[model samples]
Target: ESHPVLEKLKAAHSYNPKEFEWNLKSGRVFIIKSYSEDDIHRSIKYSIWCSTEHGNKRLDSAFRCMSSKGPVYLLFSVNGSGHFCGVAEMKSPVDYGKFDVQWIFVKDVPNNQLRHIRLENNDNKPVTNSRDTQEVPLEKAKQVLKIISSYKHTTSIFDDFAHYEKRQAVVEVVRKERQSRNK
Candidate 1:
């Protein structure tokens, strides 16, 4: 079943690369945003590489041959100070259940400009309604969370209003059980 958070995130729009005025003449950067707070806190692992003519090569090799590599590089830069470079390799594949990967990209590396951003999904498709790819900003993410919270209040799996009310009343039963154990 889709949670309120996931539905709101899916409905969220994409970013435009042109608006950011990304200077493709330089380099590119990519970002990944995990929907789960725990996952984001853990830091999502990612890799960057050049697209091969015939087949893909290892990211290490691609980075070695900068000329042969794509103009873009996976990077993390926020607020101009905490800039990070290098590719990330996952120690293990993520167990996201049914959730999709949420990532974004910005072109024209080292420019330090907020424009020319692109939001991408797990499938690497750009989001169409977003302004830039600056990790959606913490404030915006919080807004999304608030919306999800409100959505849950209005929509639930109860049979009817009475059933829902009863469900709420039952919460104390579980709480009391736990509280009693603590005592």
Candidate 2:
């Protein structure tokens, strides 16, 4: 309720059909540790990853395993917030030092409702910190997804984008009509 983004998160959100299928077939799930809630909101709003000091390194890894043409799934691990807050898929690879993507899911898990769960890496080691981007095992990703499904306050951008595109089209038509009326 405190964050403005959380207020907008009350609406329904969902994944794209083709994108979700790609994730199931060949996606690599990476946990991006975020230090700021504001950054998280911006990422969700714009479908882009904000550049960080070591972002290039992370982006390189994300691009390394694109042989299957799979999408890179990102889980926003908000530090100090004690919860993984959002999920997204990378559309365009690393370019101009940023990512092109859309948020499929976002939620605010209050501290009181936090569920502490263990996540392991490819080497089967427990993940203690998330300061850097870490590729998580799909099994562990499933765990996070399951927990996220239960959260009360959540939203997504697929529907938002769909509506936004239509809105833009309508705006164009209205502007033309207004211009004619003025002349």
Candidate 3:
């Protein structure tokens, strides 16, 4: 693959609990087979809603530190020269009244920056037997959980000031170059 990050995806990756081993490629393949619209939301809701529902500080605190979002687990693999990415969220469904664990996406990770795109609920295609897999192991589960916990969401950090400032910086540089050329 031409992309640099693709190589890092192939190194020896495994989860705890010997019986709970999973590969990124296989995980992506199996996960998308049964995806749905409510899956991601419930996964997010359970982690936040369920943890807080019990009022347990120990569990609550750990989750709070993970940034109050679905610690959505992400998996990565390559199919031939193309790269694929998957994300899983595991939590009790509080908002939509559904409680099943399944993948939310199985698609190619965009190599170029996306000005706009989200594999949202509207885009999700329904999968059959949506309520059958609660037996997923923690060891393998933990790996994805860790990714969810560590994910840095910069979407909330955008500011009009910063956006305009960046644009101005580029404009200033271009203007200076043009003036110097005309001189």
Predicted model with the maximum TM-score? 2
For model 3, residues 43-151, the per-residue Cα lDDT tens digits are 3223222222332333334334446343423332222212223344433333433333334333334322221222222242222111222122334444443433343
Model 2 lDDT per residue over 1-183, tens place: 133443454343453222333226566777777766656655765667855747756766666667547767777767776556667777766766787767876655443443444554434444435445777677666666555556666543322544544565697899999999999
- Model 2 residue 17 distance off true place after TM-score fit, in angstroms: 10
Each model's total of backbone clashes: 9, 0, 2
Model 2 misplaced stretches (Cα beyond 4 Å): 1-23, 110-116, 122-128, 154-183
TM-score for all predictions?
0.20, 0.61, 0.20
Candidate 2 structure, TM-score to reference? 0.61
lDDT at 16, model 3: 25
- Cα deviation in Å at residue 92, candidate 1? 18
Residues 15-88, model 1: lDDT tens digits: 11223322233332334222222222123221222222221223223334445433323333323322222122
Candidate number that wins on TM-score, 1 or 2: 2
- Candidate 1, number of clashes: 9
